[PDB]
Design an enzyme around this catalytic site. Structure first.
Site: not given
Length: 81
Positions: A25-27, A29
């Site tokens: 997980a990113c910011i 997505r």
């Protein structure tokens, strides 16, 4: 409140535990590598809160905004335990 079932719902939407090979997980997505993209319910993910869903390679990226990192962690916990 009650008992959240968000983690199992997402895992089911992504095709089940046997379909998930990696979680990241990113910011904005949630990136889930899957063994079979055809098992992923893209419409179901949107119903669960995804702003959008994009298939990229053997992966599926779902935009859950700022919640992404938290959902990712809950998914792993549910898959492990």
């Amino acid at each position: 409140t009650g008992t959240s079932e968000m983690a199992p719902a997402l895992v089911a939407a992504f095709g089940g535990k046997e379909n998930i090979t990696n979680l990241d997980a990113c910011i904005t997505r949630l990136r889930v590598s899957v063994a079979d993209v055809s098992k992923v319910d893209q419409a179901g993910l949107k119903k669960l809160g995804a702003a959008g869903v994009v298939v990229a390679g053997s992966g599926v990226q779902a935009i859950f905004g700022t919640k992404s990192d938290n959902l990712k962690t809950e998914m792993d916990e549910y898959i492990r335990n």
